[PDB]
Structure formats: structure tokens, C-alpha cells
Design an enzyme around this catalytic site. Sequence first.
Site, PDB file in Angstrom:
ATOM      1  NE  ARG B 266      -3.707   0.253   2.458  1.00 53.56           N
ATOM      2  CZ  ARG B 266      -4.787   0.729   1.845  1.00 53.56           C
ATOM      3  NH1 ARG B 266      -5.393   0.018   0.900  1.00 53.56           N
ATOM      4  NH2 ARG B 266      -5.267   1.923   2.166  1.00 53.56           N
ATOM      5  NE  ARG B 281      -3.219   4.408   9.024  1.00 59.04           N
ATOM      6  CZ  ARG B 281      -4.350   4.164   9.679  1.00 59.04           C
ATOM      7  NH1 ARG B 281      -5.078   3.090   9.388  1.00 59.04           N
ATOM      8  NH2 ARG B 281      -4.754   4.980  10.644  1.00 59.04           N
ATOM      9  CD  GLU B 353      -9.538  -2.534   9.549  1.00 55.73           C
ATOM     10  OE1 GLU B 353      -9.654  -1.293   9.416  1.00 55.73           O
ATOM     11  OE2 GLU B 353      -9.171  -3.288   8.622  1.00 55.73           O
ATOM     12  CB  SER B 356     -11.933  -5.414   6.988  1.00 55.09           C
ATOM     13  OG  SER B 356     -13.006  -4.584   6.579  1.00 55.09           O
ATOM     14  NE  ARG B 395      -3.617  -3.222  10.436  1.00 57.43           N
ATOM     15  CZ  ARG B 395      -4.087  -2.036  10.817  1.00 57.43           C
ATOM     16  NH1 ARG B 395      -4.708  -1.901  11.983  1.00 57.43           N
ATOM     17  NH2 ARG B 395      -3.950  -0.977  10.029  1.00 57.43           N
TER      18      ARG B 395
HETATM   19 CA   LIG Z   1     -12.967  -0.494   7.105  1.00 57.17          CA
END
Ligand SMILES: [Ca+2]
Lengths: 428, 428
Positions: B266, B281, B353, B356, B395
Site C-alpha cells: 500500500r 499502516r 482493526e 475486515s 497486526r
Molecule cells: Ca474499514
Amino acid sequence: MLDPNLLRTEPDAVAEKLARRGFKLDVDKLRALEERRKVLQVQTENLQAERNSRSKSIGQAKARDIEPLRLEVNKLGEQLDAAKSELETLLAEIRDIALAIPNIPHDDVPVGRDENDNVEVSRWGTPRQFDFEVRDHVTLGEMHGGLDFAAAVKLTGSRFVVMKGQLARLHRALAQFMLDLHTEQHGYSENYVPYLVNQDTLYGTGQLPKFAGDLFHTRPLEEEADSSNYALIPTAEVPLTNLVRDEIIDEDDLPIKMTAHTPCFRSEAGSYGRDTRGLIRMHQFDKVEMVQIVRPEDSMAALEEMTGHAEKVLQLLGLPYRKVALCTGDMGFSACKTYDLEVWVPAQNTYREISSCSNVWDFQARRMQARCRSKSDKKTRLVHTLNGSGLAVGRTLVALMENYQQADGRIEIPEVLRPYMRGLEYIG
Amino acid sequence: MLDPNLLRTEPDAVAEKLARRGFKLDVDKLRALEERRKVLQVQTENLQAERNSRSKSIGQAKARDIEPLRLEVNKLGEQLDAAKSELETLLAEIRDIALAIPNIPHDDVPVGRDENDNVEVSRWGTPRQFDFEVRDHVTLGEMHGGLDFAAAVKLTGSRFVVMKGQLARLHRALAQFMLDLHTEQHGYSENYVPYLVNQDTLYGTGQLPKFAGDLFHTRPLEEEADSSNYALIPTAEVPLTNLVRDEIIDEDDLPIKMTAHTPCFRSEAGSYGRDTRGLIRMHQFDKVEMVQIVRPEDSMAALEEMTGHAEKVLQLLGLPYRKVALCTGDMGFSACKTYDLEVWVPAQNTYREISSCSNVWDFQARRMQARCRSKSDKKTRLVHTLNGSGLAVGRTLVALMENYQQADGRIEIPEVLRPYMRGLEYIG
Ligand SMILES: [Ca+2]
Ligand SMILES: [Ca+2]
Ligand SMILES: [Ca+2]
Ligand SMILES: [Ca+2]
Ligand SMILES: [Ca+2]
Ligand SMILES: [Ca+2]
């Protein structure tokens, strides 16, 4: 890069050793550039001195009209900036030459023109006699529905694969087995490394300046426009070796033995024709890399040790192979000495490269400024670096599928891998 | 993409459902373009007919002077090519609009403006009370020497990591455990997929046209100049979902349940400020993805099943979490319904999070032309696709390190992971 003083002191001797690789060192151009560099260097350094002095004369009278003096310092500053740029352009021309020079082969390396002049050192195991016509890994892949090249052309393009099910699991099992072997038994520490690297990293291990075309390059990110000119790693040798860049390691802490499991990305430029089908010559392939950072006097011993580690993977897996001492003309750019392990490939009726173990000497260490120091003495020296695959996972999957195929196309799981496959004996 | 006939038949109704996401459908522009498309379409098709007829008249007289007739066919051919280009430019303007439309939220989705309007559905486990000040994963990383961000800045740049030793091994152990859980217990088939994908793939799962800026893009290869405009995968949802592109699957063969362990890339554009430090991130991060291809009537049931699979990883690992039903305003582009699992993060004093899980309905299936057919009937229909992480490995490593830290900084290995770590109880 080679020692600049070894290029200054005896250029005809290094050109002679390099000629054995089939490399012509432009000794005359290097000399002509070097002679002009000394002229520009004396002029620049003289300008630096007189600008430094006139600047000090201002601050002395400022305490005591700083205008006729201020103009002179600006005229000298213009002159010095022009002089420094002119010198830097020449320094960049010397670098274009110096950094495109391959490593000097060690005297252990047999003199040769190409791969046909490589010397076989060892051979292990006996190629299997089959009671049926041998199928290749592509044919077996299709029978199991486990190797899908058409799906990879659809997702991406040619020289990619999609592995599905049990064959995908077996590929993971191979990598797990190799990582566990090197971390548990061979003294390698495990690492998770970036798969994207910067230009400094690429210069460090020798991919830049000469081999940019062998890489996949990323477009810079808008929010990192001047710091994101990255390339995808072609081997984990690139990130792993570069971990010691700009470090002074205490000799007591050597050897530094690192391993990683990563995908590797190659553009495969120039490979137009050779290995059109299969897991051989792919744009993306997994490898379990071994990298060693050692004291200059231990590199030759470390090469034998590291090659033995890659051989051990093949022996445990029951895969017959040959060990080859690469000649001067078939070595990679950074290497001074190399052993290639070639695994038996039943459908090809020959041995194919699965590992390439190299002693890089101080060639990458010089580019990276990677050095070591005994606390006992006031002397730092460049470390030696080594790298080799233990093994190329995709190529191991090919050799495993083909050597262990059953008459019906089932794949027997090598005994050493069964614990990695919940004791499963066969795929299919 | 949404059904074109649902946009034609009731545009005010779909614009209403889309307004709940905070998306304004330009119904007027779509209508104006569509009205011009019918005019150009009648003209083009009439030109195609008259060019086809005049071409046939030549071949009839050729058997029987093919010159005044040959000129006319060239004048019509010029006219038709111009007409076809003019129509195609308009078709491309409709596509720019249609393909930038997010999915219609399902009626199950609570109406909301943003993340502050998300509804908590479930909560599992109780956040740990510590007898010392909690250290974050970065601090623990440094204590163990296992997480090195400075080395990653050196190799590459910011938002990258180098994991070294036991923490690198633990990260691998997590991924192995997740893959084994989903393949052995949850009915997912394992896959090795390309990490570079083409434009068709990106259009298929919805990254193109609207989210090109979220990706790392590769420069085309000289020897593949017109077929190598690739991007690095941002999730394995992209390669996995696209495996069913242009396929008619027999309904008996559904569900197709696929899993993969891949790095994800990303660009993190727009994330200027949010999560400057840590494994959160990152430009590069590992994920164990779950993808389901199901019959249209089973997608809602498959969502609950898939979310339960990601929850199971958290429960086995002893990681407290909350399950959140995302509102209309906090959903991703392709999703019609989403559940986010948020793991307890001791140093952040909140849930973050980690998964998802989305039901995409027929939105990607329409873009990919992925459909199913009961052999019993003469009727094909678009499949439904679903995706979710089980889990984001980086994570999970953060949540594990922080929830299992000891007073001295040692990391207790969760009981379910000890077999993946040779029975090791603690790191350090
Ligand atoms: Ca989301
Ligand atoms: Ca020591
Ligand atoms: Ca070689
Ligand atoms: Ca080398
Ligand atoms: Ca079935
Ligand atoms: Ca989605």
C-alpha cells in the site's frame, strides 16, 4: 567495487586477472581521468582555502566597511561552485567506470570462457530409473490441477504461476523445512526483510549501476516523490547483505549468519527463448537465502560451510545433484569464487542449477562501508560477504515432483517433509 | 460495477441507497450521456449495415468493374471508423462514471456518516490488567532487537520493517498457524499467487479506476513494453477473487473457498499523520486472506461463516477483541455488508482493526464476468464474492507482543503457537 589503490598501484595486474572473466579494463581511460582529477582537485582545494580565508577577513573587519570584501567572497563563491561541479561531473565519470568493474576472481577459480569450461567437483545420489515415460512438472501440475500458468497469465502475464491446493501446500512445506534446517541446525538467524529496496541498497550489492534492466522498478509515490525510487528484490542477498551497510562490527560478533524466505523478482531481460515453459526462469519465485558476514580470513572456510548447508537440503530431500566449481567466465558480477549445485531433473535428462554459493570477498563490503574491528587493536578492515540459496523453492518443487512422480502421476512426499505435511505420504 | 439495467430502470432509487454512503450519483449526467449513446448507436449500426451490404455488392459483381463501388466502400469505411471512435469515446465517458460508483449497501447495514456511527455486535475476552507500565510493540521490538525500523529506512525508506531472530520466527509461526487453521479446519484450499497483477485484475476487484493512487506501480519491462503495466497487490483478495474471471462455474462446485499468505503493498496516500510509529499502516505487510466464491443465495450465510473463521484465530490466540458492524459511511468501495474485528491493543488502550470481512454481492462478479450455472436449468447468473483477513499477520504480532509481554519485556508464546515454535514458552 575494487580497491581504488589497487587500481592506482598495479592496474595492468588487475586488468590481467579481470581479462580471465572476459572483461577488458579500460586502463588508459581510467589513467587519463585520474590525471585530470588531480589537476581539478588542486584547483578546487585552493579555491576552498582562499574562499575560507576571505570569509574570515570579513568577520575580522566587521568587528573593527564589509562591501569590496563581500563582492570578492561572492565572485570566489561562484568560481568555487563552478569548480566543484566540474570536478563532480568528472568524479561521476570515474564512478561509471569503477562501479561497472566485476570482482577479481580468486586463484582457486579455474580459467574458462563460459559454462562449458566449469569443473565438476562432487556428485551425490543416483538418478532414478523409471518404469514409465517421465512426465515434467508442468504435466504433473495439470494432472493434480495444482500448477496453473493460464490463470497467472490472466491475473498478470507470462512467466508467473498460480499454485493451488496440495502442490501450493508442498511449496510452503519446502520453504518451512529449509528455514527450520538453517535456523535450528546451521546457525542462521531468521529475518523478515522489505521486498522493495532503494538505490543505495542496489549499489551496495552490485545490481546498480550495471544491472538496472534485470529489475522491476516502482514509480515514485506522490507523497514520497524524491525518496521512493524503489526496485523489487531480485534475491534476499540484496536486503540481507545491506544490513551491515555503514557499520563497524566487533570481530567477536562475527560471523553474522542470516536467512530469509522471500519472493524474488526478475525482469528476465535477454532470456528471449531459454526455458519458455515451467517454474524455471520466472518473473516471481521464492527462495530461502543464506547470507554470511565474516572476518576476511574466514571467507574461504565459510564458502565450504555454506555450500555444505545447501547440499544438506538436497541430501535430506533425497534429490541427486552435482556440485560445480564455476570457471572465471561463468561467474556472477560480485563473486570472486562460486559453487553451483545442479539438481537432477528427470524430464530434462540433465542436472539444473538450484543453488549458487559465492564468496564476494570485500567487493560489497567496500560499496557498503561494512567493516569490523578487533577491540585489541586500533585497526578496522572491510568484512567479507557470502551468499547462496538453500534453496530456490520453485526449482526444488520441480526436482521433487519429477524425481518422486508415480506411474499414475501421484507425488510421493519425501520422508523428511512428511512432518511438514501432517505425515501425508502421497499427493493424490 | 452496479447492474446497468438497475441504473437505467430506477436511477433515483439506487442514488437514494448510495446517498447513505455519502455518495451523490450524477443521475442527470448519466441520462444525458445514455440519450446521446442511443443516437450514436443507431447511426453506427446503420453505417455497419450499409458498409456490410456495399462490400457484398463488390464480391457479386467481381464474379460477373469493381472501381466506382470500391471507392464508395472506402468512403463508408472512413465514415464508419470515425463514427465508431466517436461512440467509443462516449462509451469511455460512461465507464468513467459507472466504474467509480461504490456498491449499494445491503439493508442490514446501519445508516451512518463515519466510523463513529459503527455498531458493536459482539465482544470476546477481557483486556489484561498489568502490574507494570505497558510497553508498546516498538519498545519490546527494540528490547529483543527483533524489530528494526532504522535498518528498513536504510534498505528502503519509512513505513517498512526488518524483523530479526525469534520475533521474525514468531511472525512466520503466526502465518503458518492461520494457513493451517483455514485449510485443515475451515475448508479453504491453499494458493500461491502472483504479487504483481495487471490492469484487468485491478478493474475486476475494484482498485481501478478510482484507487490507482493507493498502489505501488511497476514500470513496463523493455521486452514486454505493451503487456507489463503491473501494480503490486494491496491484498490477496485481488489475485484470489480474479481466479474466477471469465468462468462459468457449475453450482455443484460452489462454494470455492481459497486462502493465501502473501505480502501486501500500500502507498498509504492520504495517511499523512495517522500511525507514524509501528507495524500499523506499513507500505509492506503480510496477511492470511480468506476468499469465498458462492451462489447468490448463500453470501449472507458465508459472511457469518467467514467472520467466524477470523474470530476463531483471535480466540485460539487468546486475544480479546470486539466485532463491529460497519455503517453505510465507513464501508470499503466493493462491499455491500462488512464486519470488522478489532483486537485489544494494550499500549493504545483501545481496540484496533485486525480483520475486515465483506460480502461484495455481484459487484466484482459483474466486473469479472464470473458466473455459475445449475446443469438442471438453461440459466447462468453472477456469483457472489466475499473476502476477509484471517488475519493481518503484522497486526496480530503487535496484539500478541503487547497482550503477552512480561514485566522484563519477555514475550509469552500463546499456548496454541508453541507447537509452531518447537514448544518454546517465552521469547527471551
Ligand atoms: Ca474499514
Ligand atoms: Ca561471539
Ligand atoms: Ca551462475
Ligand atoms: Ca554474487
Ligand atoms: Ca460439490
Ligand atoms: Ca471489499
